Write a protein that binds this ligand. Structure first.
Ligand SMILES: C[C@H]1CCC[C@H](C[C@H]2Cc3cc(O)cc(O)c3C(=O)O2)C1
Ligand SMILES: C[C@H]1CCC[C@H](C[C@H]2Cc3cc(O)cc(O)c3C(=O)O2)C1
Ligand SMILES: N[C@@H](CCCC[NH3+])C(=O)O
Ligand SMILES: N[C@@H](CCCC[NH3+])C(=O)O
Lengths: 504, 487
């Protein structure tokens, strides 16, 4: 019973203190790490001992067994690697205490420090042969086995148990950090300058989403958490930082599911004198090279339908297909979506397409939401075997994107999808301040109908446009979703160390 | 003159250009070379030399307009913090593209332009682009301020882009900031440390003593606190076996704003399993000495502590730095004895009376930790200005997450590093006995019950460090968009 277990262990701690022993020593000076130990002594022969080499090593005990009264065996793990501990009565320093009393105390989970020599057992298992083993920090609960952590929510609420017991968990999070490292180096090598912009602002603009609100007490001031980094980054382009980017958290106050956590990690970059076509190329270069950097090939396996179903192969070899959103919806639905797309007639037509196909009506049935819903069900799963771009979005869906230089009513916008999930959003940046105020005014008229995700107008941002924003191309990436596909995860909670959870 | 009228005339110019068939905001100009690359490639030209057969496309912002008659127009063109001259001569103008004077008469200071031309140097020797054709790419519709207009004003903070265009030193301050963070990340990574992201919104805000921001998630129907530190989930990852772990990111404190306090600021915290207080003292001297030498090529720097209108002091980052035990120094400087327990009525009253004796400000509430803090602030924290130094061995009542001192009762194995009286670092041997932790977050307390190895952890205030290494007196000068009182 776990509860009695914990109580006996706590009593043990107290009783050890009462006898004069410190169960939590301040410092043990380690000589070698467990990965270093494996590298150095892997080449030893079966049964070879180096008894003149005395080492101080630490780690977490993960298995306890005995062979008689003079032999105790353990697994010792550290930094994701494992060695055996072979405690023989014949090598024990009896001046430190009784052998059996010393090792009877150890439990699965204890952190220990060992003074001993390296070698391999007769079977051939690389081992540390202790002369003395010291408790550094007890595990007071029973550690679960892999089956206890398998199909549970414990991994999200006690991530440390997952990291200790599931080898795949460590690897997922190492890949996540490698992906971010690769992206930072990719941009820095191309002259980009990393900055930090405020997470708390008077307005939350740069995307269409409901924000979190907070309050600064001394200023008696309500502030919004940022939903995107787009607006202050473009003001820095005005300021002459012509290649600027930010990798950090944004906050969106909306529904939670397998591809939505309320805080998530984005990268946005802004590139003065680039356009749509440079951004398409950047995306293909970046994703193809990232995948090759991680896997040595451009093709990966992904269990789109979970581990109980067949996986699919995703090929990141460029180029990727491009699909124009309005043209394709018109072809697949056999309708003509007349401009203005936000006219009453086009809105009624899109509603009827949705109702005819038994699709859910967006809670406010705005033209921009109607089109999004249509693309979701008719386009975004056109390709699963390769990423692809949906391109040339209407201006009503894209209030900060520059008008399309040859197609009226559209913009120079691209979104990349992997397995039906949006991972990238980019466009030629709107830089005419007179057209920008018009877009914000139209977004206000859409807010008046009950749209809580209509981005609010930023007076400071519009003012910065009046000092001259050069022609610019900007791009944003969803780091968590990218990591999901590159670690074979179906849930954003599997690639975030501490996902947003209700209290226990 | 009249800034409002200027903007109205420029807005009419944009609209009139559109009416005449010209697009004053073209979609794409394909540049051949940047302004820094131009200076590098053609700096070695000779006085008066032209390379008329090499045609380049270049872009930038016009920052000065002057003329020598109608046939020679001169401009300053800036990009990426560097500048060249533009020499528009009627004799080289491509008249097939339009009328010369009609073209250049339109240019105003601040305009972003694209130039097709050739490189060269003037007779006097000024490196120049010689346009055959110039195109407007994005107009500046307002009059730019003078450097004098940005000097003592909040325009630098409320329109930071004007500060970056007009003050060359501003770009330099933020480049140094990014170099500082790049250095720290590399320093940690080369030593085996693993960078992570922990939540900014939590059910509890712990890891420091500060009032938090509160927000609400609508669909979970849940109040959440913005983090005041990264300490607690990072130690949970040490329990998880990530034995060298760190995070560089924003934390939030809902308190007063001043020259060293911005409500959001950038911290780095790292956690080092099997290290202790002594390892962290060495790390700190190793890191700051190597950081300053990396940036300056020397260990000594100049800092204008009392403002740019006063004499600068010299800060020597040569290690080692002095260590000052807080309690015994407060005792020495005041010739009192602070008997333990430090939270007894007798020791509290003595700290209160010594505060009253020196006419010092009295904390509300006057807890023992708050009293000890004020006494260190008034009596220790400005002991050294010529070098960074450490205050060490804080009482347990001030350090609920720090491990008890292995030989000194009532103290902890803690260190804080100060530069010019300002705290930039806080570190300690981590308390890992859950029995002592509860006496001092339920999910954090439970994780300790699974075994936290002996560990040393450390935090840095990135903005305050940047202030000292960029010669700034205010944190507003090292944050691109600092929190201001709304206009
Ligand atoms: C910067 C964006 C560019 C490409 C699309 C990405 C969208 C972004 C949308 C989103 C909303 C939300 O409420 C919670 C989430 O986790 C996400 C997410 O992961 O991706 C990111
Ligand atoms: C992580 C900490 C380690 C060493 C002390 C530093 C203190 C930290 C305190 C603080 C409070 C505040 O409300 C606003 C601020 O900007 C700062 C700051 O910059 O430094 C940072
Ligand atoms: N702010 C966008 C990403 C950048 C789009 C191009 N400026 C988003 O939230 O999706
Ligand atoms: N959480 C501390 C920094 C780390 C101290 C060592 N664990 C602070 O906010 O000051």
């Amino acid at each position: 019973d776990p509860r009695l277990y914990f109580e006996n262990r706590s009593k043990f701690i107290q009783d050890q203190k009462d006898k004069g022993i410190n169960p939590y020593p301040h410092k043990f000076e380690r000589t070698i790490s467990i990965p270093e130990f494996i590298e150095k002594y892997k080449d030893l022969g079966n049964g070879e001992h180096l008894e003149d080499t005395i080492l101080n090593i630490t780690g977490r005990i993960m298995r306890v067994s005995a062979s008689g009264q003079k032999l105790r065996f353990f697994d010792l793990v550290g930094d994701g690697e494992k060695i055996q501990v072979l405690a023989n009565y014949s090598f024990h320093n009896h001046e430190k205490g009784n052998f059996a009393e010393c090792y009877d105390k150890i439990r699965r989970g204890d952190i220990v420090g060992i003074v001993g020599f390296p070698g391999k057992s007769k079977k051939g298992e690389l081992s540390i042969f202790p002369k003395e083993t010291i408790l550094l920090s007890a595990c007071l609960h029973m550690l679960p086995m892999k089956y206890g952590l398998k199909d549970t929510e414990i991994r999200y609420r006690q991530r440390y148990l997952d990291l200790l017991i599931n080898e795949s968990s460590r690897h997922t999070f190492v890949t996540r950090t490698k992906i971010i490292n690769f992206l930072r180096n990719f941009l820095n090598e191309r002259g980009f300058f990393e900055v930090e912009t405020p997470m708390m602002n008077l307005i939350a603009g740069g995307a269409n989403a409901r924000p979190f609100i907070t309050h600064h007490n001394d200023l008696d001031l309500d502030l919004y958490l940022r939903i995107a980094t787009e607006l202050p980054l473009k003001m820095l382009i005005v300021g002459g930082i012509d290649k600027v980017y930010e990798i950090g958290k944004v906050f969106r106050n909306e529904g939670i599911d397998n591809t939505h956590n309320p805080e998530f990690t984005s990268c946005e970059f802004y590139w003065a004198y680039a356009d749509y076509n440079d951004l398409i190329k950047w995306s293909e270069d970046f994703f193809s090279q990232l995948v090759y950097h991680l896997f040595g090939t451009y093709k990966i396996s992904y269990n789109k339908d979970g581990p109980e179903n067949q996986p699919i192969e995703i090929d990141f070899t460029p180029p990727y297909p491009k699909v124009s959103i309005v043209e394709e919806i018109e072809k697949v639905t056999n309708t003509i979506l007349e401009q203005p797309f936000d006219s009453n007639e086009t809105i009624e037509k899109m509603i009827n397409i949705i109702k005819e196909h038994k699709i859910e009506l967006p809670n406010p049935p705005t033209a921009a939401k109607l089109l999004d819903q249509l693309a979701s069900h008719f386009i975004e799963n056109k390709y699963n075997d390769k990423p692809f771009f949906i391109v040339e979005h209407p201006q009503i869906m894209s209030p900060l994107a520059k008008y399309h230089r040859t197609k009226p009513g559209l913009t120079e916008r691209l979104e990349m999808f992997i397995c039906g999930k949006e991972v990238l959003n980019a466009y030629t940046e709107l830089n005419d301040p007179f057209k920008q105020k018009e877009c914000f005014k139209l977004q206000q008229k859409d807010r008046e109908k009950g749209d809580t995700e209509a981005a609010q107008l930023d007076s400071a941002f519009c003012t910065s446009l009046e000092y001259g924003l050069p022609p610019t191309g900007g791009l944003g990436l969803g780091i968590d979703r990218i990591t999901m596909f590159l670690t074979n995860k179906n849930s954003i909670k599997d690639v975030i160390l501490f996902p947003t959870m209700r209290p226990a």
